Amino acid sequence: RMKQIEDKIEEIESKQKKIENEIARIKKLLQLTVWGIKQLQARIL
Amino acid sequence: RMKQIEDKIEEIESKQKKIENEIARIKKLLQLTVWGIKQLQARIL
Amino acid sequence: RMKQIEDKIEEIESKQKKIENEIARIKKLLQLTVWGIKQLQARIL
Amino acid sequence: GXXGXGXXXXXXXXXX
Amino acid sequence: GXXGXGXXXXXXXXXX
Amino acid sequence: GXXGXGXXXXXXXXXX
Ligand SMILES: [Cl-]
């Protein structure tokens, strides 16, 4: 049982890293949208 | 103790799934904002 | 070994909370962008 | 896009 | 919205 | 910004 618990914990760790990678990608796109809105505002208004 | 560890691991798994669901919802809204900026740019500029 | 497993589980829990905090911050910025697009649309169109 | 309806004024950002 | 201040030119996106 | 290229019409939102 200890080995099964350990293997599951490593799998949870792995998934946590993929979640963190997903979050980084979301932040990069969110920053592009912030830039896009700033650009529209400056160019038009 | 093993049962307490196992129950906690299942709870962490459950929360990881809710986090993943939260992320999917954020991505859907982020994609709407990308579409909205694209629309403003096309309609105006 | 049980103590090492327990300490790792608490560390995973801690990280899950920081991830949740990150998500809350992303949501606050995403809501600002939604407001910004709504403002551009109303002011211009 | 934007919820359809011909655009619908944005449909409140596709209902948020 | 946007940080208040009458709009404040967007206030840098409410300070990012 | 926006992928460079002088702006590039937004470059598809910097390639999404
Ligand atoms: Cl997690």
UniProtKB/TrEMBL annotation, chains A, B, C:
<protein>
    <recommendedName>
        <fullName>Transmembrane protein gp41</fullName>
    </recommendedName>
</protein>
